[PDB]
Amino acid sequence: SMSTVWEENSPGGGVGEVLSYKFASPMHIGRILIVNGDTSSKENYYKKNRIAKADVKYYNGNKLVLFQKIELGDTYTKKPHHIEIDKKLDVDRIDIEVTEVHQGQNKDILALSEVTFGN
Numbered sequence: 001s002m003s004t005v006w007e008e009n010s011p012g013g014g015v016g017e018v019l020s021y022k023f024a025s026p027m028h029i030g031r032i033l034i035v036n037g038d039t040s041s042k043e044n045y046y047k048k049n050r051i052a053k054a055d056v057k058y059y060n061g062n063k064l065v066l067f068q069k070i071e072l073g074d075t076y077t078k079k080p081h082h083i084e085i086d087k088k089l090d091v092d093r094i095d096i097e098v099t100e101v102h103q104g105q106n107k108d109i110l111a112l113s114e115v116t117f118g119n
Contacts (some may be wrong), residue, residue: 005113013107015107016098021094030087030118031082031085032085034070034083035079035113035114036072039078047106048106050101051072052099053100054070054098054099056068056096059093066089070083094117
C-alpha cells in the first residue's frame, strides 16, 4: 500500500522533521501502530536513534477533531507500539511532529518496518 519507509529530508533519521501527509478523500481511523528502529537491544538503542516523543494530530473534516501526544518513557521493546484513538470519526489530515531524540549516536540508522494507520 504505502511506498518507502520514511522521507529522508537530510539529517539523521529525519531528526526533528514534520511528518505531514495530504488527503485524497475522507477515511475512518481507529488505531496507529509504530515500531522503533529494528529493536535489536537496549544497548543498540543507545547506539541507535529513537523517536522518543511525538505529537500527532488529525485536522479537517470539522476543524480540530483529534489531538494527542505520545512518549516511550523508556522500557523494553520489540513488537510495534500501539496508540488507541477514539475510533469514531473519518477525516484525514495528518500532522506528526517529532521534537527530539535520545542519544542518536549513529545518525541515520535502519528505517523502521513502517508505522500503521487505521483499524
